[PDB]
Amino acid sequence: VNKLRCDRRPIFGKNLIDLLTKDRRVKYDKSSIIDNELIKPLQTRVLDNRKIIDTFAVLTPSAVSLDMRKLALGLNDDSSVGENTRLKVMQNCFEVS
Amino acid sequence: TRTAAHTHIKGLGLDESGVAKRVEGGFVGQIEAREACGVIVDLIKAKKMSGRAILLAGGPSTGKTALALAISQELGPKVPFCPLVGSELYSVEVKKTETLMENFRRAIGLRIKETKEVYEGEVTELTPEDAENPLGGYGKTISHVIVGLKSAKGTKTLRLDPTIYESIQREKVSIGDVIYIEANTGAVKRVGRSDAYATEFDLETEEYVPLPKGEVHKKKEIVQDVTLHDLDVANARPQGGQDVISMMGQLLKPKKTEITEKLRQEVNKVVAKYIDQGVAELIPGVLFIDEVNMLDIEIFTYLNKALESNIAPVVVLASNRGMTTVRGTEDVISPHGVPPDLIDRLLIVRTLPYDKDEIRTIIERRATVERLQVESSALDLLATMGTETSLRYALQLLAPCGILAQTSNRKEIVVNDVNEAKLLFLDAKRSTKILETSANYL
Amino acid sequence: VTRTAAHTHIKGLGLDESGVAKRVEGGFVGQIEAREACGVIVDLIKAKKMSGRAILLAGGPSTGKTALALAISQELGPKVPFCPLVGSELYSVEVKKTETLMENFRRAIGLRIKETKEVYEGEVTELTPEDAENPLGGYGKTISHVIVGLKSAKGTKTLRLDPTIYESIQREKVSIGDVIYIEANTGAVKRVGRSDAYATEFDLETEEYVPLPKGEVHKKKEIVQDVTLHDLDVANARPQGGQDVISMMGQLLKPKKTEITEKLRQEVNKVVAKYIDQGVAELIPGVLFIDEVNMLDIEIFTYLNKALESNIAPVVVLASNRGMTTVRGTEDVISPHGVPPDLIDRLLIVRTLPYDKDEIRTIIERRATVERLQVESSALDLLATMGTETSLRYALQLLAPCGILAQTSNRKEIVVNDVNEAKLLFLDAKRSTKILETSANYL
Amino acid sequence: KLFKKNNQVNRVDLDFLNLVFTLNDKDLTSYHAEEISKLTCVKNFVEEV
Amino acid sequence: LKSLSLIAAHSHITGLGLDENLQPRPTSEGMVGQLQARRAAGVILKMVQNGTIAGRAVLVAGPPSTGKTALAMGVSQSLGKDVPFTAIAGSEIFSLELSKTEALTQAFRKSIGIKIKEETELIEGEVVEIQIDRSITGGHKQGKLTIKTTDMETIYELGNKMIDGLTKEKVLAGDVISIDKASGKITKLGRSFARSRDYDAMGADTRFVQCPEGELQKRKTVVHTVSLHEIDVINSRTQGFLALFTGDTGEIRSEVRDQINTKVAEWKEEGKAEIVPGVLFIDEVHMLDIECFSFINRALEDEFAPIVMMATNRGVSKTRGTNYKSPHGLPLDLLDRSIIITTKSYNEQEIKTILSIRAQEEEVELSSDALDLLTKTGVETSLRYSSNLISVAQQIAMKRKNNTVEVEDVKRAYLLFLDSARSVKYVQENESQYIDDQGNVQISIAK
Amino acid sequence: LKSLSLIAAHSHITGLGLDENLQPRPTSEGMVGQLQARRAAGVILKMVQNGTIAGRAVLVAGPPSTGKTALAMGVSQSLGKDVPFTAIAGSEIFSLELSKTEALTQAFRKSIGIKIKEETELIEGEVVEIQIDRSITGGHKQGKLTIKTTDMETIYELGNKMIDGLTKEKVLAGDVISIDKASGKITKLGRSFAFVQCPEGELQKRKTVVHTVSLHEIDVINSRTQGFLALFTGDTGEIRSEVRDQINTKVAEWKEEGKAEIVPGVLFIDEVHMLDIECFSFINRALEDEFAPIVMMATNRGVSKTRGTNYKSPHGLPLDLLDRSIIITTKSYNEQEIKTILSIRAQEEEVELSSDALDLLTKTGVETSLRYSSNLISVAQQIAMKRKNNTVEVEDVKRAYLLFLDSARSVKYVQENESQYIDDQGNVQISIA
Ligand SMILES: Nc1ncnc2c1ncn2[C@@H]1O[C@H](COP(=O)(O)OP(=O)(O)O)[C@@H](O)[C@H]1O
Ligand SMILES: Nc1ncnc2c1ncn2[C@@H]1O[C@H](COP(=O)(O)OP(=O)(O)O)[C@@H](O)[C@H]1O
Ligand SMILES: Nc1ncnc2c1ncn2[C@@H]1O[C@H](COP(=O)(O)OP(=O)(O)O)[C@@H](O)[C@H]1O
Ligand SMILES: Nc1ncnc2c1ncn2[C@@H]1O[C@H](COP(=O)(O)OP(=O)(O)O)[C@@H](O)[C@H]1O
Ligand SMILES: [Mg+2]
Ligand SMILES: [Mg+2]
Ligand SMILES: [Mg+2]
Ligand SMILES: [Mg+2]
Known part of the structure; x- marks a missing residue:
């Protein structure tokens, strides 16, 4: 236990997490502007272009391989990844919208 | 307090729409040149003409970049200024055309001014104003909400329509905590608890903001400036925190693609929508491209195409070339390496070298900027050697001269000190001569 | 059965203790000077004191540059690290060649590391967290630390297990009564399978029914494994992997190779110095061998001009087979072996020599012994001759067809007729160009 | 299965040997590491010894 | 001591051989001679320590093995730690993934450092x-x-x-x-x-x-010693440290560079962060492309322009990227805004002193007459050749096991290993033996 | 309307300005002179407004200063709304990350529009x-x-x-x-x-x-799921020909269905005198395509070495293009016509010109070039306001002329200023002695 403590304890990061979180942080306050409505983000653009995306989407991939989507990420009944890794990714994908 | 062969220029050194002073703003000579420069600056300040180009030509040591920095200084920080070089146009990540387009859109800038009344301070009291609903109902009916707000040297009680309850639910503030209110749009914002409450708990993570300065109600101005290129990038780049596209932005290599022209026309349309309303205002910028000789014929053709645009600001070109072969076609030899098609579409200014008195003034002004002083003898000999060797060789010897004077503990320079300074370092001509006189591959 | 590809006939330089190379030894006949110089280079590398030196081997083809390089690699031993390299291998597509050649330079040197770990085994009966009878006012007593009595037949102990090791336990979906294997430090969980007690419960089961391995619960083992420097380089630059979803995503992020910054290398160097002060690790030098150097770009030459200046540069041995040749990537830069003089200023030139008829006879008979093929004296003389006038390589290539022609004639020895028929059915470069001179349409 | 032969006998974890510091900055402040390194408390096991 | 103790090309020089009055002792600090070069290098080092002005460049002129790299690394060592020194090569800057202008931008950024x-x-x-x-x-x-x-x-x-x-x-x-x-x-x-x-x-x-x-x-x-380039990287990406270690900088746009410069100025005026003078050194700059030359000319006038060191042994020769020649193989535009230092070959006394100090660094004991003959080889050959000769003679001596390196020991070492002159003579007299440039070589031995 | 239009060399022109019988007026709707060029522009205008025929491309050539892009902008604004017009630079198509051929295909497809x-x-x-x-x-x-x-x-x-x-x-x-x-x-x-x-x-x-939509956006959004973001960002390319011809058949059957009507727009390509033979061959093929919108192609170089071939191809173009392309040529302008164009520009940019000042501006424009006169008429405004009067006098324009040089005079100056500047080798005399 003494040697375990002597070896495990000296674990030091490269620079920090405080350094990155303080350089990322900006001293500027909120200072809200109309830029929020001006930008109209990409997700909102997809949302508001519903009419055109539903009126101009006709084709289909006439051939597709079933269950190849599962093996694309490697999740299936038999794989080298963890047993409940596939369960967790399936669940969070269920919540991810 | 640091500089790099510059910062001695103080604008253009002009007068009130007259003739520039002979030695003004760290300038000597080229009175006609910098008067034309001031004319150019006035044209930029006019903000009317679109897609106008100009090139200044001369030899080495002519101070073209110093003049360009003079335009940049005279413009002021409010006016955007985007320096550029023909070397960075050749980009591995994306084509030279798109890099040119982005540097083009960087020069132009958009300014927006915003107005909003602010109610802020410590919430002294919260109470609804119950009333009688027009339709008979056993339930309660509140018609107003009275909030008591306390700021520095002033307190205020304001009635609020009971629609403010939804905002107060979105904020979760009850009492003893400073809030943020605006007049017309309503809503609430929470900044933090009152600073006097910190002593209540020995240990807590909440920083307690002080009582806001000034009265409870305020009306401040918001000024913001953004280049159209930044708005293009913001409208183009995705943003998110949870959606799949959010970390598709991550776990990859974010590369700048060629922005579609429909995005540019749409953002121009919204800029028009916000400038006619008066919220936005457009001020043209300038793109400073020096050593344009290094650019290829493709860049010249695209500049010819793009100079006619109506969001095209003034562009200034700098090059020391003359009758030289154009990059891309060895047969085509054009003045300053630029094909004559652009030259006809732009204006041209000739630059001349500096005289012995002007070099003396340059040396003395540089010494004063360096905060190191030169006596008459060393100044004269340094001027003579600068006239015979080159401008830069005399210009850059001040630091070794100063450090050598410091080694001998003398504040100023003397004849043997500057003689040693010449001895240690050799200029281009001496280097070439020792090159031909050396057979050891040196 | 026995496979031979132009090699395995040499077992190193095999020089004497005085350094003198005998006439015939270890697949080497004659060639005293180059073998002695190579032994001197071995004495250089075994000194374990000097770095940054380099040498280039020069001469015409078929003289045994590859043979000498393989000999020095063999005598150095598998413990001593070696990095073969070809000139065409340097030219990559993902990152610039400088990163690749620094990668090879780091790959040259190695370092063995002493380490000790703890071993545990036994079958599983308990899946319970800490009961924590005292609530203390902060705990609704329960923890993601499942206490398991490690039921080995020879010992049992209840362990407070990390959420990660218990998560790996859940990955194996263990039940009551099955052997488990865990680690004190890493917590790695592997199960040999269900115990043979539960074998009779199911008439069939995918899970394998296994007996309990013999041994104590807590066992301690030490390793002195040798790992090269650049495996640690890539592991530090990019984490290798893990069973958890977070590690799965992390290794899914960036699996491609890019440049390597020096700060991590220097930190690793400092911690290795700390280890050698502790005695945990001991460094070993490295050798880098480059093939067909005449084609290298002038930029590579310029960078290698300063690569040897670095204190981490190991000995790099070089081979070239050119005379007055212009350096590739240049126009008028012409020099011996196509290498700029600035590089060769610090290098040492060693030259190989041709051979006499007896040497060809000796190498031919050594080869014939290598492929356990017996030949007659007259056929041996013919092979030695035609090798002298045509090439050694042609004779070596057609050695096997001679034996095949003997075998299809139900003969175990090569005769004059065998080599004559082989020459009938195969032609060397000389008669190839003779035939192609008189070509109707480039015959 | 032909590749999952016993490697623990000849594999180095290299994670317990604090040489994976590129992942350490995710959840570590510099001053915390500085203060936890200087609290390498020897002689506490030695006094029990 | 924290770095590797393995003997590099110059493991005998540690710092600068000058005094307080910038006067070089003939044999001191591990480097011998180059008195004018030593004094000029000390002038540059003192000005770097001053750091009051920037945007200057310096170049050293001399034949190969004259000490250009030796002087540069001695100046770097005398500079000491915590002062950002960046050493790059003119060849590695040609990046297939990064633009050469962008690579030079990072090269300049790494040279200057900031204390926060x-x-x-x-x-x-x-x-x-x-x-x-x-x-x-x-x-x-x-x-x-x-x-x-x-x-x-x-x-x-x-x-x-x-x-x-x-x-x-x-x-x-x-x-x-x-x-x-x-x-x-x-x-x-x-x-x-x-x-x-x-x-x-x-x-x-x-x-x-x-x-x-x-x-x-x-x-x-x-207090943190953090240069500008890594702050650029960490601001460019959500997790910039991984890009710093791996090098996948992604061609950081110049739009954030103005913002980071403004933030640096804000911290400087607030006193939160202070800058540290930096030195940039490039070896064998004679090979370089004209876009890099133009970008260097442009960036030398910026405020954030550290001192730049060049080394070149080329005479008047052609520049890469252009057909025509120039002095030192470098455009006259760079020579205009630069100061050039001249270095010369060492004499027999300097050569023997260099051999003695190199043998001491190698811990190789020698004889007086052996030293004289090694110096004779070093003056007939190049200086870098006799060092390798004595290096090999050390192991040949320990093969002979008789302590000091012997005269016949060095003679046999020279006999076993060909010099450049002997190699060229052997190639010329046996051009048939070697594969010629045209692709013709005599394979048959018997005539 | 309500769109930004700053002072530009193509803002003054507004429409073609030709009668219903397509005989242009000498000065109408922004253009002066080039009567044959303007009537040819009207010919192309009636071609494009008919819309029955496809696969038509034209050559507009001649020396510089002939108003080639002036006529192009005039015909584009004559097209106005209800029709898409695409202007593309010849050097723009050269991309290192985007395939040239399929980028050219999508360039053609942008011109074709569908209204639903x-x-x-x-x-x-x-x-x-x-x-x-x-x-x-x-x-x-x-x-x-x-x-x-x-x-x-x-x-x-x-x-x-x-x-x-x-x-x-x-x-x-x-x-x-x-x-x-x-x-x-x-x-x-x-x-x-x-x-x-x-x-x-x-x-x-x-x-x-009604939705004004071009076939290109249908193709890109139907190519893959990320087609929307590719369209809104520009990081697309290498669209498979399968979706191409599938959408071609779909729009053909929709057109015969009468649900939506197609509008074949006009494509503008510039300075193709510098281009590749790959481009030339592919456009030779694509002109014969059924879904080929009218293509406007402009050039300025005469006989020169076409890039990609050693020989000096006549007119800077290969003969296969000239076989299928009709040529429109523009002549120069007389002094009176140049004066009229300068007067039109002055009326557009609202500066008072003295009669003698304007006449000498015209004569010096004829002497040097009309671009020089175009920039001089702009700088004359600031020269005149610095003396506090909107009227531009002879001294204003003469001061501007002595302040700014022309290309020819600067060329001659550097002929006497050769030594003060480096040569092609790089030899200069920075010194004076
Ligand atoms: N009017 C002036 N007064 C003083 N110094 C000047 C003046 N004009 C130029 N300079 C000098 O010229 C230098 C800039 O030259 P630069 O434009 O880079 O060279 P070039 O014009 O040959 O390209 C500055 O360092 C400045 O000291
Ligand atoms: N002195 C030698 N003794 C024994 N075999 C030799 C000798 N020289 C060459 N060889 C043979 O040459 C073969 C390798 O040739 P190689 O060295 O690749 O040709 P090159 O000289 O072009 O590099 C080996 O199989 C080896 O048996
Ligand atoms: N001041 C010095 N003292 C001792 N040896 C030196 C000195 N300067 C150069 N050398 C010798 O020069 C060799 C390196 O030459 P280098 O300076 O790298 O050539 P270049 O000038 O082309 O960079 C080394 O072997 C070293 O022994
Ligand atoms: N008939 C005209 N009416 C108005 N402007 C014209 C006329 N002819 C030429 N111009 C002017 O001449 C310029 C021609 O430039 P452009 O067509 O781009 O290339 P080029 O100079 O080779 O003709 C236009 O900017 C335009 O303002
Ligand atoms: Mg300049
Ligand atoms: Mg071989
Ligand atoms: Mg060197
Ligand atoms: Mg035109």
């Missing part, structure tokens, strides 16, 4: 006990926890928000934890030593550190 | 009262709305989507809102007295909706 200081106020103390009335009253009853240190101990109230905070990072007391005074964030460091015997095997999380000594909360300032 | 029509219904009126019935926990909110206009005043139940939309935005019962039932959008026009909106007429109306 930060003050911290944290509460450090070992917890004694925690008592929360979570059942008698529930709902964050504002329980009391006692915190001890080796010199003092107090009991701290816990608020409702503090109850929720301590609900995470659960601590059962008997454990050393620290909480930031400002942000109230609690960090669990490790238990006390009394917890070492709870179980035989524990995971990587449990640690047993000593109780913090002194008062409860303390003030400490932390 | 559909009729939608909507309700407009003044809101009367806001009333909802909801629960704090169970939800199941039941909103009701009273709407009114000048003639109809009625109450309607507000569904879940409408009540959610009304809650998501701050609404006032005095506001005037418009709702489309099929799409559910809320169009808050204005407000009643606290306030501009004043609704009238029928409460519910049905109106048509």
